[PDB]
Amino acid sequence: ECLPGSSPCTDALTCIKADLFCDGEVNCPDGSDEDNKMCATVCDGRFLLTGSSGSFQATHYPKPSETSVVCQWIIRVNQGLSIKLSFDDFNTYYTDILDIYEGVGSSKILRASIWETNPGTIRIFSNQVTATFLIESDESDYVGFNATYTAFNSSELNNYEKINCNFEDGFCFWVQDLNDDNEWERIQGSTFSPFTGPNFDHTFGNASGFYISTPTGPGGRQERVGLLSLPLDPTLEPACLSFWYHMYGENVHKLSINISNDQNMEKTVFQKEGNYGDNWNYGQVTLNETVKFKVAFNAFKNKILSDIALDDISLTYGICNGCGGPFELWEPNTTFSSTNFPNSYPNLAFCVWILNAQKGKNIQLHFQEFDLENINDVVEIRDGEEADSLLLAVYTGPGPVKDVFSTTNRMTVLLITNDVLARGGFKANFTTGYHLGIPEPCKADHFQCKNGECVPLVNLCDGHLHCEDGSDEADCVRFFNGTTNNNGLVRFRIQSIWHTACAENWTTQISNDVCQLLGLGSGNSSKPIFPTDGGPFVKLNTAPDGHLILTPSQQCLQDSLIRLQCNHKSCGKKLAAQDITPK
Amino acid sequence: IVGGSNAKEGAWPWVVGLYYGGRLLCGASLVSSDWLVSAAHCVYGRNLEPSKWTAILGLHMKSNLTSPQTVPRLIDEIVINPHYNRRRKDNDIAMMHLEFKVNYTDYIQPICLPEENQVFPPGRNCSIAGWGTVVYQGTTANILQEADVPLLSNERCQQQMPEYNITENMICAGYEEGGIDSCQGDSGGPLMCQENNRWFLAGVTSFGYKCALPNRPGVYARVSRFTEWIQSFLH
C-alpha cells in the first residue's frame, strides 16, 4: 500500500504521485502510467493521438450533457511541425473552461481559456499539446464541442502570413503574452460596459464580425494586456505596419507598440494617448530593422470605461505613404442638345428643360459646348421647385462657363433668343448626386465659412481675414432685447456661446469701436442699467496696438450692463454747397 | 427726367454713373465703401465680365471726366437678386462690387438705407436724379437732371397699370397727368425721399409703360423689402 494520495503502477513496485498520471511523462518503469485504457476518457474514448490528423468530442456530443467527466487529450506530432486546432462548434457553460497546455508533464504552459465563445482556429507552435476539458455545470441546454487537429510546418511562414490577420477566425499566429496582467478576449459584436469601445466590426461593417479587445471585466487596478508576434525575417527594404485601432473611453491612458529583438531591447515606435472618438482610426508606422524583431501591441488599461480594441493588422513593404422644344427629362437623358444643335440654332427659339430628380438630390449641370450670341441671347438657369422661380447663373457668349450646382430637385432653364444674328448654340449634360458642389464640412469643431475652407478658432471674430468671403468675421456680436433698430445690449460670442459683456473699464473709445464692429456709426452714448445675463460675460479691454483684448473671465462684483446706443452712419446728408430754390 | 431742370454740381453725390465700355446705361447708388445699388434689368446678361462696367464716382457732367473730383473705379462682381425674374420684372435690384476703396469727400458720400417696416405715406414728395432723357424719342442729357414725383398707393398703381403685375415689392411714383416722370435710359436711378433731413433710398427706377405720357407713373423697386439682402453684402 502506497502513501495516501499516491497510486501504484501495474507491477505494484513503485509509488508515484496521483497528479503524475496521464500528464505526458512516463513515470512507471513499465510504462503503465501512459496506458490508453487507464487514461481512457468517457468523452471520445481516446487519450493519446499520434496521427497527423483526427478529431475529438466531449461526452455525448449529439446529445445534452448529464454527467461531469474529466477528459484530457495529448497529441504528439513529428518534430519541427506545429499543431493546428480547428473548432467547428463550441457552445458550453462558462464553468466548463477548456484549458490548452503547451507541452507535456508538469512543465506544460497554459495559453488560453475558452468559455461561451467560439475560439475559431488556435495554432500552437509546439509538437506536443495537452488539452484538458473540465465539466462543472449540469445544464442540459448545451450541445458540446467538436474540434479537429491538423499538422503544418511553421518554418515556411512568411512575414505577411505572420502579421496580416483580420481577426475574423480566431488568432492566425499571434501568441498572447504570459508576463502581462490579462489576456485578450475574443468577443463578437457589442461587448460589456456599454458607451465604451466599438459597437461593430470594422472589416464587415456590422456586428457579425470578430475582433479582439481588452477584457471588459470590472478591473479595480491597472492591467497591462500585450500580444506577441512571431519573429520576422530581416528584409532589405523597409515595411509599413498598417492597423486599425479604436481608442474610445473615459480612462484611456496610453496605447503603445514595442519592438522586441533577440537582445531584449524594446523600442517604442508608436504611441497614442487620450480619447480619439468612437470611430476606427487609421494608424501606420514604418518598420525598419536589420535583424529579427517582434511586434507587440501592449495596451495599458485603467479601471472601468477604458476599453481598447484592435482589428485589421497587416504589414506591407515600403515606406508609409502620406417654341416646340423638349420638356422634362430624367436620368437616362443626360446628354441632350437644345433643339437644333448640330449646327447654328434658329432665331425666335424659346425652349425649357425642367430637370427632374429624386427628393433630396441636387443637379450638377456640366456644359460640354457653349457658344452663344452677345448680351441679347443668354441662358437663365433657375432653381424654382415651385411657382416662385429663383436664379442661379446667367451664362452667354462663347466661353468655358463654370459648373452649376442646384439646391432642390428641380432646375428650369430658359433659352432667350433674338430674331437676328443666329449663333452656334450650347450643349450640356447633367449628373445627379448628393450634396454636389458644396464641400463636406470638416467635423471636430471645425467652423466652415462660405468659401469652403476650415477655420475652427483662428478667425472666429478675432481680427483676421482668412476666409475670402468674409464669413470668418460673421455675426458674433449683436443687439439683445433692443427697443429700436440701433439699440440693444452688447452680447458677444467667443466661439459658440452668445453672452453679454462686463463694464469694468468701459469708455467711449471702446464704445464707438464696438459700434463700428456692429456695423453702425459711432457711439452716441452708453448708460449702464443693471445686470441680468448669467452667461460668461467678457471684460472688454483695449490696447494701444489697435485691437480690443476680450478676456472671458467669469469673475466680477457689482457688474453693470452697458445699454449701447450708436448713432447712424454717413446717411444721405448733403455736405456740398447747395441751396434751396423752389424750381 | 423729362420735365426737370439742371441740378447743382454736388447736390447728389450718391449718384454713380455706370458706363459699359464707355457708355452710360443705368444709374447706381453707392452704399458701402465698395458696394453699389442698381436695377437688375440693365445688368442682365453682363455678370460674366464685371470688368466691362466702369464706376464713375462723383460725376456731374458726362463730358468733364477730367474733373479733380472724379474718382475712377471698376466693377469686379455683379450679384443679381436671387428672386429676380426679367419676364415679370420682379425683384429688380442688384449690387455691384467696386475694385478699390474710395475716400469720402464733399462730392462722394454714401446714400442712406431704408429700415424695415418704414411706413411711406402716399403723395410724399421724393427727389430723383440721373442723366436720363428729356423726351421719349430723343437723346440723353449731358447735364445731371433732377425731378420730383409723388408716391402712389399700391392699389391705385395696380388700377392705373392693368397690363403689369405690381407685387408687394414695387412702390410706384409719378404725376397723375404725366409730364414729369422717368424715361428711357434712366431706368435704374435712385428714388430719394426726404425724412428728418435724410435722403433714403425708397426705390430704384425699374420700368414703365411709356415716357412723358399722362396717367403713366413710374415703377420703383421697393428697396425696403431687400434690406437684409443688401446688409448681408455690405460687410
Numbering used by the authors:
A (entry chain A): 183 to 504, 524 to 784
B (entry chain B): 785 to 1019
From the paper:
Human enteropeptidase (hEP), also known as enterokinase, is an essential enzyme in food digestion and is localized at the brush border of the duodenal and jejunal mucosa. Activated hEP can stimulate the conversion of trypsinogen to trypsin via cleavage of a specific trypsinogen activation peptide, namely Asp-Asp-Asp-Asp-Lys (DDDDK), which is highly conserved in vertebrates. However, the mechanism of hEP activation remains to be established. hEP contains a multi-domain heavy chain and a catalytic light chain, linked by a disulfide bond. The light chain is homologous to trypsin-like serine proteinases with a typical Asp-His-Ser (D-H-S) catalytic triad responsible for peptidase activity.
And active hEP incubated with nafamostat was subjected to cryo-EM structure determination. Cryo-EM reconstruction of another ~29% of the particles of the active hEP-nafamostat complex showed an intact hEP with the LCM domain rotated ~120 degrees from the position of the inactive hEP LCM around the loop between MAM and CUB2 domains, with this inhibited hEP LCM in close proximity to the LDLR2 domain. This considerable flexibility was thought to likely facilitate substrate recruitment and expose the catalytic site for subsequent cleavage. The light chain was observed to remain firmly clamped by the CUB2, LDLR2, and SRCR domains of the heavy chain within the core region, allowing for the intimate interaction between the heavy and light chains after the hEP-activating cleavage. The binding of nafamostat or other covalent inhibitors to the catalytic site apparently results in a change of the conformation of the hEP core region. The complex marked by the dashed line displays one of the active states stabilized by the inhibitor.
